[PDB]
Structure 1
């Protein structure tokens, strides 16, 4: 009914690693998009939208502005039952 946190972490890890601005060696399961990754807010909008691409669910504007960490993205998709 709900995706497991291990599978939903491998997906969000693979997206941020394959991103155009993020380095592979800099990312870690416990990292921040702005401090630990060095992305701007317009770049955070891109990486969240990239997560919305692999997970067919649609994230509203308010629930997307809270995703500033990789763990926050994991918690949101895990609690969302509408994930494929």
Structure 2
């Protein structure tokens, strides 16, 4: 395996688990709005659940930039404080 895959695997299960998200539509490249059909309030929920997974309180300016699984994976995998 790999650390990036470790992160991607947990992000995938977090996003799939969201009640509004069709888990069968989720890919490592899925964009929350354009692919998964979420609205702005939904994205806040998913990102917070991602923050829960890695115990990582993300500053608002960085957290608003996370709109897709690649965005989330790229930010978490480079953050040495992800748990």
Q: Same fold (TM over 0.5)?
A: yes
Judging by fraction of residues, say which structure has more helix.
Answer: 2
- Structure 1 unaligned residues grouped into runs of 5+: none
Quote how far apart the aligned CAs of 1:51 are. 0.3
Cα distance in 2 between the residues matched to 1:16 and 1:68:
12
Gaps of 5+ in 2: none
Deviations 1:23-54 (A, max 9, x none): 11111111100000000011000000000011
Higher-RCO chain (CA-CA 8 Å, sequence separation at least 6) = 1
Task: State the TM-score, normalizing by the size of structure 2.
Answer: 0.95
Q: CA deviation at 1:57?
A: 1.3
Q: Detail structure 1 runs of 4+ shifted over 2 Å in the superposition.
A: none
